[PDB]
Amino acid sequence: LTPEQIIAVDGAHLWHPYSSIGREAVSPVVAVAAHGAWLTLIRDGQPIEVLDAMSSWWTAIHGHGHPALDQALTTQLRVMNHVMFGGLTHEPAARLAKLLVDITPAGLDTVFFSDSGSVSVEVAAKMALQYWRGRGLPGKRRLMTWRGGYHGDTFLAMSICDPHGGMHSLWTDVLAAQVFAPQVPRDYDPAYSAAFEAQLAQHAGELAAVVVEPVVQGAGGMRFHDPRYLHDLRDICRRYEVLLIFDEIATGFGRTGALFAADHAGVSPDIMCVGKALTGGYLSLAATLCTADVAHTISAGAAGALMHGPTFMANPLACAVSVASVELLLGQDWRTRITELAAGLTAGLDTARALPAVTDVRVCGAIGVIECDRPVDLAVATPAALDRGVWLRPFRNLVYAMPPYICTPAEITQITSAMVEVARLVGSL
Amino acid sequence: GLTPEQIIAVDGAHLWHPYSSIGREAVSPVVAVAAHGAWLTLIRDGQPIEVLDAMSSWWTAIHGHGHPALDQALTTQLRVMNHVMFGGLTHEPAARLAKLLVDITPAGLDTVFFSDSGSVSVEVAAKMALQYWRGRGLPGKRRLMTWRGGYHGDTFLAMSICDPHGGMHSLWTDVLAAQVFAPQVPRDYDPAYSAAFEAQLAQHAGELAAVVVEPVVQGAGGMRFHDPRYLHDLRDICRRYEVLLIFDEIATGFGRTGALFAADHAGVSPDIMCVGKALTGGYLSLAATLCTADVAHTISAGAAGALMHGPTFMANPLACAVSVASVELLLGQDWRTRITELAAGLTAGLDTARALPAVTDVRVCGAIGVIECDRPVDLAVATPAALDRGVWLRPFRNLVYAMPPYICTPAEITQITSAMVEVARLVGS
Ligand SMILES: *Cc1c(COP(=O)(O)O)cnc(C)c1O
Ligand SMILES: *Cc1c(COP(=O)(O)O)cnc(C)c1O
Ligand SMILES: O=C(c1ccccc1)C1CCNCC1
Ligand SMILES: O=C(c1ccccc1)C1CCNCC1
Partner residue facing A20 (CB), from B30, B114, B300:
B300
Q: How far apart are CA B361 and CA A356, in angstroms?
A: 76
CB-CB neighbors (< 8 A) of B82 in chain A? 34, 64-65, 69-70, 281-282
Three state DSSP letters for chain B: CCCHHHHHHHHHHHECCCCCCCCCCCCCCEEEEEEEECEEEEEECCEEEEEEECCHHHHCCCCCECCHHHHHHHHHHHHHCCCCCCCCEECHHHHHHHHHHHHHCCCCEEEEEEECCHHHHHHHHHHHHHHHHHHCCCCCCCEEEEECCCCCCCCHHHHCCCCCCCCCHHHHHHHCCCCEEECCCCCCCCHHHHHHHHHHHHHHHHHEEEEEECCCEECCCCCEECCCHHHHHHHHHHHHHCCEEEEECCCCCCCCCCCCCHHHHCCCCCCEEEECCCCCCCCCCCEEEEEEHHHHHHHHHCCCCCECCCCCCCCCHHHHHHHHHHHHHHHCCCHHHHHHHHHHHHHHHHHHHHHCCCEEEEEECCCCEEEEECCCCCHHHHHHHHHHCCEECCCECCEEEECCCCCCCHHHHHHHHHHHHHHHHHHCC
CA dist B323 and B96 (Å) reads 10
Q: Do B15 and A300 touch (CB under 8 A)?
A: no
Ligand 3 centroid to A11 CA: how many Å? 22
Q: Is the CB of A118 under 6 A from ligand 1?
A: yes
Q: Do B29 and A87 touch (CB under 8 A)?
A: yes
C-alpha distances in Å from residue B153, one per residue of A214, B76, B221, B249: 29, 32, 11, 12
Specify the amino acid at residue B37: G
Query: What is the C-alpha to C-alpha distance for residues A403 and A368, in angstroms, rounded to an integer?
Result: 9
Beta-bridge partner residues of A398: A371, A395
- Is any ligand 4 atom within 6 A of the Cβ of residue B396? yes
Query: Where on the phi/psi map is residue A148: left (φ > 0), alpha (ψ -120 to 50), or beta?
Result: left
Nearest alpha carbon, ligand 3 atom 1: A57
Taking CA atoms only, the protein residue closest to ligand 1 atom 5 is A117
Q: Cβ atoms within 10 A of the Cβ of B417, count?
A: 26
Chain A hits for B123, CB-CB cut-off 8 Å, are 153-155
Calpha distance A179→A119 (Å, rounded): 21
| φ/ψ (deg, to 5) at B212 | -125, 120
Determine the residue of A248, A395, A396 to mutate for testing ligand 3's pocket, defined as the one with the most ligand atoms within 8 A of the Cβ atom: A395
Distances (CA, A) of A261 to A233, A273, A322: 14, 12, 19
Nearest CA to ligand 4 atom 2: B220
User: Helices then strands (H, E): number in chain A?
Assistant: 13, 17
Region of residue B370 (phi > 0: left; psi between -120 and 50: alpha; otherwise: beta): beta
| Experimental technique for the deposited model | X-ray
Asked if the domains A1-65+333-429 and A66-332 are classified in one and the same CATH topology, the answer is no
Supply the residues of B annotated as catalytic. Answer: 19, 151, 248, 277
A298: chain B residues, CB-CB within 8 Å: 21-22
According to DSSP, residue A169 is labeled G
Q: What angle do CA A162, A276, A262 make, to 5 degrees?
A: 70
Q: Which fold has domain A1-65+333-429?
A: Aspartate Aminotransferase, domain 1 (3.90.1150)
Asked if A284's CB is within 8 angstroms of B22's CB, the reply is no
Helix axes A3-13, B92-104, angle to 10 degrees: 50
- State chain A's maximal CA–CA distance in angstroms: 64
CATH code for the structural domain at B1-66+334-429: 3.90.1150.10
DSSP class of residue A225 equals -
DSSP H or E run through A358: strand A358-363
This PDB structure is determined at a resolution in Å of 1.8
Q: Which residues of A touch B88 (CB under 8 A)?
A: 16, 26, 28-29, 378, 382, 393
CA B212 to CA A280: how far, in whole Å? 36
Taking the C-alpha atoms of residue B133 and residue A175, their distance in angstroms, rounded to an integer, is 17
Task: Give the HSE-up count for residue B331: Cα atoms under 13 Å, Cβ half-sphere.
Answer: 13
Does an H or E element contain A426, and which? helix A409-426
Residues having CB closer than 6 A to ligand 2 are A 310-311; B 117-119, 122, 151-153, 214, 219-220, 248, 250-251, 276-277
How far is residue B200's CA from residue B139's CA, in Å, rounded to a whole number?
A: 20
- Tell me the CA distances in angstroms from B33 to A81, A88, A156, B55, B277, one per residue in order: 11, 10, 36, 17, 22
Element holding A286 (H helix, E strand): strand A286-291
**DSSP alpha helix (H) spans, A228-361:** 228-240, 292-300, 316-330, 334-349
Q: Report d(CA B222, CA B299) in Å as an integer.
A: 35
Residue among B311, B300, B237, B289 at smallest CA distance from B86: B311
The ligand placed nearest to the CA atom of residue B399 is: 4
Distance CA A23, CA A171 (A): 22
**How many Å lie between the centroid of ligand 1 and the Cα of residue B312?**
7
How far is residue A320 from each of residues A5, A64, A75, A271, measured CA to CA in Å?
35, 16, 9, 24
Angle in degrees, 0-180, between the axes of helices A334-349 and A409-426, rounded to the nearest 10: 30
Looking at all shown ligands, the one closest to residue A367's CA atom is 3
CATH number belonging to domain B67-333: 3.40.640.10
Output the CA torsion sign for B364, B365, B367, B372.
Answer: negative
CB B106 within 8 A of CB B266: no
From the list A298, B399, B13, A317, the residue with the least C-alpha distance to B29 is B13
- The alpha-carbon gap from B191 to the nearest alpha carbon of chain A, in Å, equals 35
Ligand nearest to the CA of B150: 2
Closest by CA position to B400, among listed B429, B428, B421: B421
Show binding-site residues of A for substrate: 276
DSSP string, A130-158: HHHHHTT-TT--EEEEETT----SSHHHH
Work out the number of other CB atoms within 10 angstroms of the CB of residue A176: 18
Closest partner residue to B307 (CB to CB) among A15, A138, A154 is: A15
Ligand 3 first shell, C-beta below 6 A? A 57-58, 218-219, 222, 250, 395; B 310, 312
Note whether B278 and B101 are within 8 A (CB): no
| Rounded Cα gap, residues B97 and B8, in angstroms | 39
Alpha carbon distance B157, A155 (integer Å): 6
CA of A284 to the centre of ligand 1 (A): 11
Q: Could you tell me how many CB contacts below 8 A there are between chain A and chain B?
A: 396
B135 is an annotated ligand-binding site residue: no
Radius of gyration of chain B (CA): 22
Give how far B154 is from chain A: nearest CA, Å: 6
Alpha carbon distance A122, A110 (integer Å):
16
Q: Burial of A406 by CB count in 10 Å (0-12 exposed, 13-18 middle, 19+ buried)? A: middle
The rounded distance, in Å, linking the Cα atoms of B228 and A369 is 56
Out of 3.40.30.10, 3.40.640.10, 2.60.40.10, 3.40.50.2000, the CATH code matching A66-332 is: 3.40.640.10
Phi, psi values for residue B42, rounded to 5°: -115, 155
User: Judging by beta carbons within 10 Å of its beta carbon (0-12, 13-18, 19+), is residue B26 exposed, middle or buried?
Assistant: exposed
What is the rounded distance in angstroms from the CA atom of residue B129 to the CA atom of residue B274?
A: 13
* CA dist list (Å): B75 to B68, B78, B226, B286: 11, 5, 41, 17
